[PDB]
Amino acid sequence: HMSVAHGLAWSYYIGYLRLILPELQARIRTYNQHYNRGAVSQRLYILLPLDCGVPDNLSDPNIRFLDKLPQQVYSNSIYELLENGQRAGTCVLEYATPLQTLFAMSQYSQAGFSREDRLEQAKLFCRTLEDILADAPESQNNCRLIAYQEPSFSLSQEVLRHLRQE
């Protein structure tokens, strides 16, 4: 209840996920009802790279930006997940911002924080966030956490493994 990763998971929920998820299904449903290659899935897919290697802003060639999810100010992007050149799925995808902070804390002396500490805190953040989202009222059936560690790796396949299984 006092760790670095506990503070970050509660902040990401309090200051962002609790304010965006109550209206996320309505925005996806509106875009699906109004427009149409494939229906956009009803959940927010949050990428959780355990190595905390999050691009500055956001990101594989098989993950093509399709459009922005409009409001009923949050810019949420819809991506087309490709396989063999053709679209295999489509969803609102984004990186878990607090993993950038865990990476920065490991790079700056002022924090200390080793590479082993960062990897342990990243899994702890993922666990704490999972536990928050399981019991949170504003996050019932519209959020899926995608945690993974790169060792042949495809980010599009990791998201497709979760989209097909739902």
Add this chain to the structure above:
Amino acid sequence: HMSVAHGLAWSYYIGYLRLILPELQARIRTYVSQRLYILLPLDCGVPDADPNIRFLDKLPRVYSNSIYELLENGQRAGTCVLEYATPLQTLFAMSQYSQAGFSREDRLEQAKLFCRTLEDILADAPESQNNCRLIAYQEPFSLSQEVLRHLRQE
């Protein structure tokens, strides 16, 4: 670093202050003191505050900040871009949510740890010392006087 406060201080810098401060002086110069004044109430009571702090205009990632006129005796004594440190709202919410297991004593201790951690980060950050001032305080009071004590001394 070690605790909840350290993660919040580094997040506040990484995800917001490092992206907004490089261009803050240019926005103020285009449009008021040249620094961002961040209110840090140690009780984490972040609402909005005082009749002597009147909203003047908006300063035309980081998306817009408010300029306020600090009054004293009915007349304007200063003007600056002022805002609350959002992570203190999170410390307050963590104390109000059971699944966080964070007491009122924990919240006050983490609030001070956050102020000191963010002051150290900002002293050595290339995002610059000249564009940001932290205003930490605990109510036993005028919020306009606390800001004026820092504006006049700079």
